[PDB]
Design an enzyme around this catalytic site. Structure first.
Site, PDB file in Angstrom:
ATOM      1  N   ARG A  70      -5.120 -11.702  -6.746  1.00 11.15           N
ATOM      2  CA  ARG A  70      -5.065 -11.352  -8.159  1.00 11.15           C
ATOM      3  C   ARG A  70      -5.767 -10.019  -8.303  1.00 11.15           C
ATOM      4  O   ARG A  70      -6.942  -9.904  -7.953  1.00 11.15           O
ATOM      5  CB  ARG A  70      -5.834 -12.364  -9.011  1.00 11.15           C
ATOM      6  CG  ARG A  70      -5.193 -13.732  -9.186  1.00 11.15           C
ATOM      7  CD  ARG A  70      -5.819 -14.521 -10.326  1.00 11.15           C
ATOM      8  NE  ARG A  70      -5.114 -15.776 -10.560  1.00 11.15           N
ATOM      9  CZ  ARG A  70      -5.393 -16.930  -9.954  1.00 11.15           C
ATOM     10  NH1 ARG A  70      -6.373 -17.018  -9.057  1.00 11.15           N
ATOM     11  NH2 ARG A  70      -4.679 -18.009 -10.250  1.00 11.15           N
TER      12      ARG A  70
ATOM     13  N   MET B  91       2.631 -12.487   5.151  1.00 11.06           N
ATOM     14  CA  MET B  91       1.767 -12.066   6.253  1.00 11.06           C
ATOM     15  C   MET B  91       0.490 -12.903   6.232  1.00 11.06           C
ATOM     16  O   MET B  91      -0.510 -12.513   5.628  1.00 11.06           O
ATOM     17  CB  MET B  91       1.436 -10.577   6.114  1.00 11.06           C
ATOM     18  CG  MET B  91       2.651  -9.664   5.990  1.00 11.06           C
ATOM     19  SD  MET B  91       3.649  -9.560   7.492  1.00 11.06           S
ATOM     20  CE  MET B  91       2.630  -8.508   8.516  1.00 11.06           C
TER      21      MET B  91
ATOM     22  N   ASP C 248      -1.062   5.742   1.106  1.00 13.19           N
ATOM     23  CA  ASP C 248      -2.098   4.724   0.946  1.00 13.19           C
ATOM     24  C   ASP C 248      -2.293   3.887   2.211  1.00 13.19           C
ATOM     25  O   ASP C 248      -2.428   2.664   2.146  1.00 13.19           O
ATOM     26  CB  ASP C 248      -1.786   3.834  -0.266  1.00 13.19           C
ATOM     27  CG  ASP C 248      -3.032   3.141  -0.831  1.00 13.19           C
ATOM     28  OD1 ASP C 248      -4.171   3.487  -0.429  1.00 13.19           O
ATOM     29  OD2 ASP C 248      -2.862   2.250  -1.693  1.00 13.19           O
TER      30      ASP C 248
ATOM     31  N   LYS D 274      -4.455   2.370   4.968  1.00 12.65           N
ATOM     32  CA  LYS D 274      -5.841   1.963   5.177  1.00 12.65           C
ATOM     33  C   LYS D 274      -5.860   0.521   5.689  1.00 12.65           C
ATOM     34  O   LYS D 274      -4.924  -0.236   5.421  1.00 12.65           O
ATOM     35  CB  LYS D 274      -6.648   2.076   3.878  1.00 12.65           C
ATOM     36  CG  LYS D 274      -6.003   1.398   2.680  1.00 12.65           C
ATOM     37  CD  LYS D 274      -6.880   1.485   1.447  1.00 12.65           C
ATOM     38  CE  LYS D 274      -6.239   0.771   0.269  1.00 12.65           C
ATOM     39  NZ  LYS D 274      -7.114   0.794  -0.935  1.00 12.65           N
TER      40      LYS D 274
ATOM     41  N   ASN E 273      -4.503  -2.361   3.680  1.00 16.17           N
ATOM     42  CA  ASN E 273      -3.056  -2.364   3.439  1.00 16.17           C
ATOM     43  C   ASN E 273      -2.216  -2.602   4.695  1.00 16.17           C
ATOM     44  O   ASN E 273      -0.990  -2.651   4.612  1.00 16.17           O
ATOM     45  CB  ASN E 273      -2.620  -1.057   2.770  1.00 16.17           C
ATOM     46  CG  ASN E 273      -2.990  -0.998   1.299  1.00 16.17           C
ATOM     47  OD1 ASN E 273      -3.341  -2.007   0.684  1.00 16.17           O
ATOM     48  ND2 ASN E 273      -2.895   0.189   0.722  1.00 16.17           N
TER      49      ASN E 273
HETATM   50  C1  LIG Z   1      -5.300 -15.248   1.215  1.00 17.51           C
HETATM   51  C2  LIG Z   1      -4.996 -14.593   2.561  1.00 17.51           C
HETATM   52  C3  LIG Z   1      -5.323 -15.528   3.727  1.00 17.51           C
HETATM   53  C4  LIG Z   1      -3.587 -14.131   2.600  1.00 17.51           C
HETATM   54  C5  LIG Z   1      -2.568 -14.850   3.234  1.00 17.51           C
HETATM   55  C6  LIG Z   1      -1.272 -14.354   3.237  1.00 17.51           C
HETATM   56  C7  LIG Z   1      -0.988 -13.145   2.613  1.00 17.51           C
HETATM   57  O1  LIG Z   1       0.294 -12.668   2.624  1.00 17.51           O
HETATM   58  C8  LIG Z   1       0.613 -11.486   2.016  1.00 17.51           C
HETATM   59  N1  LIG Z   1       1.890 -11.051   2.050  1.00 17.51           N
HETATM   60  C9  LIG Z   1       2.242  -9.890   1.466  1.00 17.51           C
HETATM   61  N2  LIG Z   1       3.661  -9.463   1.542  1.00 17.51           N
HETATM   62  C10 LIG Z   1       1.294  -9.112   0.808  1.00 17.51           C
HETATM   63  C11 LIG Z   1       1.698  -7.814   0.169  1.00 17.51           C
HETATM   64  O2  LIG Z   1       2.920  -7.582   0.053  1.00 17.51           O
HETATM   65  O3  LIG Z   1       0.823  -6.995  -0.212  1.00 17.51           O
HETATM   66  C12 LIG Z   1      -0.028  -9.538   0.759  1.00 17.51           C
HETATM   67  C13 LIG Z   1      -0.372 -10.741   1.371  1.00 17.51           C
HETATM   68  C14 LIG Z   1      -1.682 -11.213   1.352  1.00 17.51           C
HETATM   69  O4  LIG Z   1      -2.571 -10.549   0.775  1.00 17.51           O
HETATM   70  C15 LIG Z   1      -1.995 -12.423   1.978  1.00 17.51           C
HETATM   71  C16 LIG Z   1      -3.297 -12.921   1.975  1.00 17.51           C
END
Ligand SMILES: CC(C)c1ccc2oc3nc(N)c(C(=O)O)cc3c(=O)c2c1
Ligand SMILES: [Cl-]
Length: 497
Positions: free
Chosen positions: A168, A240, A287, A289, A292
């Site tokens: 969030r 991911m 961006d 980093k 990301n």
């Molecule tokens: C809470 C933590 C263990 C976790 C688990 C799976 C996640 O799977 C994601 N997939 C994405 N496409 C994006 C994105 O497109 O930014 C971000 C995340 C997460 O932050 C993410 C964070």
């Protein structure tokens, strides 16, 4: 979500042929676009070639080249030999007679990394002529249309079950969800409509959507579906589960943070491949980093959050605009000057530095610095290197962290090929890396959770008109990948049980 839904799987049924007549006209029937770039098209095209004796040689040669391209170095000499003996000998049963004498002779010589690439271009050129024409006039093309019709059917929020919250932040929430029919797991990013309007976040969201849609790379998060709800604009994309790189740097082993050099190099190589993919399409990421760069179940990484990304129009070589994260923005950007793809490579240097050092090149561990102070350091401070950096790591980071973008290593002659030849990637098989064949150095534990974190306006015509344009629907390639991965393609694409 330990269960697909049979109610929604039932909706995945092939239509009668008459419903595909309209689609047949309003569709790109290019050979490259249909039979190479679209997984189901390729699959159906190869089935066609399989079932026609005369195209057997071309099909098997095509497969064996792709086999050779992804094989282990130890097996390559053998596979090269078998290939030449099978297809490039006049008396051989599967002799490819459609080739020229020039191409066959060429392919019989040399044992380089790019071997059989001219041969592949010749095969695909041949297949795109007569065999492709025959395919269009066969049942296999009609079956492709049936799959394309099904691809175009509405698949909005009702097709996705959210089962946990991931983040969030700015502009909305990110959920982990299941596509109900197939059961495949996705990440759904929901942008609140009212909040977007209030922040005027239409351009940034629209630009990101269009980029994620048109780009298809294993090192960039893929967009699968884009739809709208009453309250949100939703982007269903590659999940991911490993979380971001930054967490893995600091929050596993807190007594000795940072990655081992082989691991850092692997991720760097994967990030480079992602950057190249964008730059070859005249897109600047802006961006890059650790936070990301995300990890999946297998231990492979992708770049994510293209909200600050920008696409150069035709003819334009450089851009202007202050955007990025403090500590990763290049000097030429900080000075308010024009810049190109070089800014992403500076960020890569910082990203790699932080992976090994477990700190920024311009701060100590855990040091909080104001943006004006950090701006001065990037422009003026020389980067020092502790003993954990090898000669290769240092040299590479020094090349990437060049303050002058003219002296900086990066995108040259339409590729990163010059960057690949650095001694840092000595033990990296680029060929296998790009095909996703290499075994990752660290595999995330699925038990372990690698994370930390926890006005009234009315809509006008321009808002709803924008939301429909945003809600473009199903992305063709990622959808086809899903149908195949989950066995729905195999299941529905039968002929005789
Ligand atoms: C809470 C933590 C263990 C976790 C688990 C799976 C996640 O799977 C994601 N997939 C994405 N496409 C994006 C994105 O497109 O930014 C971000 C995340 C997460 O932050 C993410 C964070
Ligand atoms: Cl047929």
């Amino acid at each position: 979500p330990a269960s697909r839904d049979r109610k929604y799987l039932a909706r995945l049924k092939l239509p009668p042929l008459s419903k595909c007549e309209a689609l047949r006209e309003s569709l790109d029937l290019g050979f490259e676009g249909m039979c190479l770039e679209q997984p189901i098209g390729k699959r159906l095209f190869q089935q066609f070639l399989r079932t026609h004796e005369q195209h057997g040689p071309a099909l098997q040669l095509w497969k064996d080249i792709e086999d050779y391209d992804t094989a282990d170095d130890a097996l390559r000499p053998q596979k090269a030999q078998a290939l030449r003996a099978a297809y490039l000998e006049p008396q051989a049963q599967l002799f490819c007679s459609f080739l020229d004498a020039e191409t066959v002779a060429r392919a019989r010589a040399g044992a380089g990394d790019g071997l059989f690439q001219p041969l592949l271009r010749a095969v695909l050129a041949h297949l795109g002529q007569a065999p492709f024409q025959e395919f269009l006039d066969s049942l296999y093309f009609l079956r492709f249309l049936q799959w394309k019709w099904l691809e175009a059917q509405p698949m909005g929020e009702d097709w996705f079950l959210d089962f946990r919250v991931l983040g969030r932040g700015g502009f909305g929430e990110v959920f982990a969800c299941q596509m109900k029919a197939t059961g495949k797991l996705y990440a759904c990013k929901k942008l609140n409509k009212k909040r977007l309007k209030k922040r005027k976040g239409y351009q940034g969201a629209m630009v990101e959507k269009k980029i994620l849609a048109k780009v298809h790379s294993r090192f960039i998060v893929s967009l699968a579906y884009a739809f709208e709800t009453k309250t949100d604009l939703c982007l269903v994309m590659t999940i991911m589960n490993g979380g971001d790189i930054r967490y893995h740097i600091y929050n596993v082993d807190e007594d000795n943070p940072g990655f081992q050099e082989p691991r850092a190099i692997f991720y760097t190589a994967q990030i480079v491949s992602g950057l190249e993919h964008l730059h070859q399409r005249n897109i600047i990421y802006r961006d890059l980093k650790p936070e990301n760069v995300l990890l999946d179940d297998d231990g492979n990484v992708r770049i994510s959050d293209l909200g600050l990304a920008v696409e150069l129009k035709a003819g334009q070589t450089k851009t202007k605009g202050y955007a990025g994260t403090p500590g990763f923005m290049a000097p030429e950007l900080l000075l308010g000057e024009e810049y190109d793809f070089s800014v992403d490579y500076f960020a890569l240097g910082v990203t790699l530095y932080e992976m090994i050092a477990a700190r920024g090149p311009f701060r100590a561990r855990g040091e909080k610095v104001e943006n004006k102070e950090l701006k001065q350091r990037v422009l003026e401070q020389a980067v020092t290197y502790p003993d954990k950096f090898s000669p290769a790591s240092k040299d590479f980071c020094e090349a990437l962290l060049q303050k002058d973008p003219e002296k900086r290593l990066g995108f040259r002659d339409g590729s990163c090929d010059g960057l690949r030849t650095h001694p840092l990637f000595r033990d990296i098989s680029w060929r296998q890396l790009e095909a996703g064949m290499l075994t990752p150095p660290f595999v995330p534990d699925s038990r372990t959770v690698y994370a930390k974190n926890i006005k009234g306006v009315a809509f006008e015509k321009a808002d709803t008109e924008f939301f429909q344009e945003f809600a473009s629907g199903t992305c063709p390639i990622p959808w086809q990948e899903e149908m195949i991965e989950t066995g729905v393609f195999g299941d529905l694409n039968v002929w005789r049980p």
